[PDB]
């Protein structure tokens, strides 16, 4: 069924699974026409496909050329996402194919189900959780590679960096979702927190700074404070 708080540890068991987020597939800049109407111009997007156990990220970059001459782009975006996910599964060796795919928005269920008819033993699941994956484009290196792309392109990342050398997947996912929830609620401040100390750097082969265990505690605390605050500033509490 649906993934929720009750069955949250299934994510870190040994059955391969992927989250699919489509929030950033179709992106625009609504603007004004010389005639005073409004027109959109698309920019490059991405599918966020993530193995929550291993941190492997399959970042499919959606180039603006995909949309040319197409109608009803918000609906196409969902079928284009489902086509790309099924192509990814097909490209993987059988022993690497997921046993479940969890979509972060329920409107992806039918598109993905239809594109995956050839894989009847892969379960397509919604979730009740409000995961903050839309904020993946606030990670500078991911945003950079999407915006520089001149053609369709798949880029592979580990979104946990080397954290799994020291912490479990469960803890790694919790750090990721906290970091992403903070960037989604107040990107400016979240980035100020992560980069304030010029002595903490991001390795060329990583996405996040090189924090000690103690420094990660301090960072996580600061991210929590920001999320509650903005919850205050947003709700006046």
């Amino acid at each position: 069924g649906a993934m929720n708080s009750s069955n949250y540890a299934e994510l870190f068991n040994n059955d391969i699974k992927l989250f699919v987020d489509d929030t950033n597939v179709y992106r625009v800049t609504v603007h004004k026409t010389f005639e005073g109407n409004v027109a959109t111009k698309a920019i490059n997007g991405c599918i966020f496909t993530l193995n929550p156990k291993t941190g492997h990220l399959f970042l499919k970059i959606i180039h603006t050329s995909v949309w040319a001459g197409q109608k009803r782009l918000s609906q196409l975006a969902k079928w284009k996402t489902a086509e790309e996910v099924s192509a990814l599964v097909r490209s993987l060796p059988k022993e690497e194919q997921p046993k479940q795919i969890i979509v972060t928005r329920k409107a992806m269920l039918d598109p993905l189900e239809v594109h995956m008819l050839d894989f009847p033993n892969i379960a397509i699941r919604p979730t009740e959780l409000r995961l903050p994956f839309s904020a993946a484009m606030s990670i500078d290196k991911l945003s950079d590679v999407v915006m520089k792309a001149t053609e369709p392109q798949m880029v592979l990342f580990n979104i946990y960096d080397d954290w799994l050398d020291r912490i479990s997947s469960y803890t790694a996912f919790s750090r990721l979702t906290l970091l992403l929830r903070a960037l989604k609620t107040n990107e400016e401040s979240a980035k100020m927190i992560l980069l304030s100390d010029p002595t903490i750097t991001i390795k060329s082969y990583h996405l996040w700074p090189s924090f000690t265990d103690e420094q990660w505690i301090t960072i996580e605390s600061q991210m929590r404070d920001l999320i509650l605050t903005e919850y205050g500033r947003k709700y006046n509490v």
Partner: protein, 300 residues
Amino acid sequence: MNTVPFTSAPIEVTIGIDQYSFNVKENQPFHGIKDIPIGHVHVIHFQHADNSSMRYGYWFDCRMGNFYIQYDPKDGLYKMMEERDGAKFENIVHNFKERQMMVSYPKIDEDDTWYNLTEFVQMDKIRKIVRKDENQFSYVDSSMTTVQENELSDPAHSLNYTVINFKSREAIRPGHEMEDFLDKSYYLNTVMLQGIFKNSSNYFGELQFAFLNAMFFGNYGSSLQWHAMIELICSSATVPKHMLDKLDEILYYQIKTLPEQYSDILLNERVWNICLYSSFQKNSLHNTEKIMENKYPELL
């Protein structure tokens, strides 16, 4: 004008014949229905007074045999049987009419309701959906499940309707995923009409038969099947123009005939609101849309 005689009526029962019903008392002197119109299939059906559980009945065509009803006190139901001896049958029927022990099929002149509900229903096709080849008539009841149902348990007592599944490979061409899911014309016109049913009349006949089994027996799998076949047409952008106009007529009479007090269970809100207000064919069902609004504006 043909006749279905009854040996007797030992238990109290509501008897139905097409869209009509009447009550017979326990051991009332009752020996059948005469003046049944030739040229149509018919259905004669039963609901016991003592146990409204199980509506059941028999589809038949009087041109294919002499049929009569006889209660079975072992199996506990009114059974249809064929009489092979022609002069035995005429003589039995003739005696029962002389004694005026038979009720008359009240075919009011002006009325074409039955014709319009069974226009495309053939006995030959009924008997492929309901497999029991030693008989010329077909038994159906409330509880019989469909082939598609048994996939999701006795195959002999099943309803072999054509399986329709909008999220299946039969329905969805590789590389046309989105196209074929949002516009089902491929599945309707190529897979089903050209491939399986061969023509629209056979398609309409199964649609009509599914609805009648849903209405008369409360057969849930038949209602599923009726709705599926409507949705496949309403969700195809390309349908032959003659099929669209006929469909409006077909549905109109089904909605007209439905008991008002049964609409809560026999009509699927989603299918009808999609067909009437959102689908490709939302503008091609004027008569059906009019009667659904005068009569069931609540569901909508």
